[PDB]
């Protein structure tokens, strides 16, 4: 895909009002990078501890991990990716750039040897594992149900459609890029 | 993808009411196979004549094509695919089987040498070329605007989301299967 096609799932799964909600709800958050950090700490410590080694935090106490370079780097990168993606979708309506960003990010992960070897739709999809923790943990902050016009049901459904579309496009772009590289 | 995942784009782009509309509007049609036939006749004769050779109708007058085996066979297969897909989506809510059907069909086309050689997202996407003629020609039958509760705008938007999702999933499944086969 070039990115400008009419089949863009971010245009199909989300309408204009949905995209505005994604941006406005994300912006309502105070310290979104801190929330992203807390969720990644849960991912590597509680949910998928195989990821500690990947991020170089297999020895760091939970309390030191945010300072370790690969781990704190990833938190920054993931936060920036969500910042840009929600802005493109919900502010500029740059639907092409939003789709292109997600597929480029999916393809780029093929360089991660852990994922090249272990990413597997039959067994573990690590993009799904990570984003599912966001679905469970980020959405209650976004609805205001948890702390650190739109109804709770609306915000929940929109963020689920959005985050599931991020999973599917990163998964598909990764899988294709890996197949091509062989 | 197994098919049962939460990232299924037919569940994300279409809600239950949308899927019911897809099924009810398709069922309102009198002789849907005839309409499918007429649209394929336009595709091969007027829009993408490179396809005449593929379907063995490079000599048949337009008036004989429906009887030629590869061409009339394809019309039957495409009609059955839409019949099953709209039933799965809109009647049984078998969203897994709907997604699986579309990806299996995408993968199966890699066996078509014309597509293996020529299918190309940079240049011509033949699934997109075919389905776009359906978007232009089938939707006015579905809305009742042309001849052979839901508003015209609703029916048009739902069928566009649906048919665009069929294009994207056939395209992606095809591309992956071709890359794997090499
Ligand atoms: C789940 C959705 C994910 C998103 C949105 C995401 C986002 C990003 C971004 C934006 C970058 C830098 C730009 C780029 O390389 O494309 C990056 C790099 C990286 N990603 Fe991810 N990532 C995700 C999941 C994962 C997973 C499951 C792994 C497991 C290995 C992973 C490992 C890495 C690593 C090691 C880097 C290099 C930078 C670093 O180590 O901090 N990512 N990721
Ligand atoms: C655009 C969406 C399309 C749909 C939904 C579709 C559907 C189907 C189905 C359901 C079958 C039989 C089952 C299977 O093999 O999976 C089939 C076979 C086939 N498809 Fe397609 N098709 C599409 C596009 C195309 C295109 C663009 C070509 C161009 C080569 C093509 C060429 C063929 C051929 C040659 C067969 C074998 C049967 C025959 O020749 O009649 N199809 N297609």
Residue numbers in the entry:
A (entry chain A), B (entry chain A): 19 to 166, 182 to 215
Sentences from the paper on this structure:
In this study, we identified a novel role within the globin superfamily by showing that GLB-12 of C. elegans functions as a redox signalling protein in the reproductive system. We observed that GLB-12 shows a hexacoordinated haem, extremely low ligand affinity, a relatively low redox potential and the ability to transfer electrons to other molecules in a continuous manner. We found that, by using structural, biochemical and mutational approaches, GLB-12 actively converts O2 to O2.−, which in turn is used as a redox signalling molecule. Based on our findings, we propose a model whereby GLB-12 acts as a superoxide generator in the somatic gonad, after which this O2.− signal is modulated directly or indirectly by an intracellular and an extracellular SOD, creating a transmembrane H2O2 gradient that acts as a redox signal.
It confirmed haem hexacoordination, with strong Fe-N bonds with the distal His92 and the proximal His127 residues. The proximal His127 is highly exposed to the solvent, which is the result of a hydrogen bond between the A-propionate of the haem to Ser126 OH. As a result, two water molecules are hosted at the entrance of the proximal site (hydrogen bonded to Ser126 OG and to Gln130 NE2, respectively), and four additional water molecules and one acetate ion fall next to the propionate. This exposure to a polar aqueous environment would favour oxidation of the ferrous haem, which is consistent with the low GLB-12 redox potential reported. In addition, residues Phe89 and Phe96 (surrounding the distal His92) are part of a wide cluster of aromatic/hydrophobic residues (Val54, Phe58, Leu59, Val62, Phe73, Phe152) (not highlighted). These could restrict E-helix movements required to achieve a pentacoordinated haem and would thereby limit ligand binding. Interestingly, this otherwise apolar tunnel shows a strong negative charge distribution at the solvent exit (resulting from residues Asp48, Asp49, Asp52 and Glu165). Further, while the haem pocket in globins usually prevents haem iron oxidation by creating a hydrophobic environment, in GLB-12 three polar amino acids (Lys88, Arg95 and Arg129) are located at the edge of the haem cavity, possibly to enhance solvent access to the haem and stimulate haem iron oxidation and O2.− production.
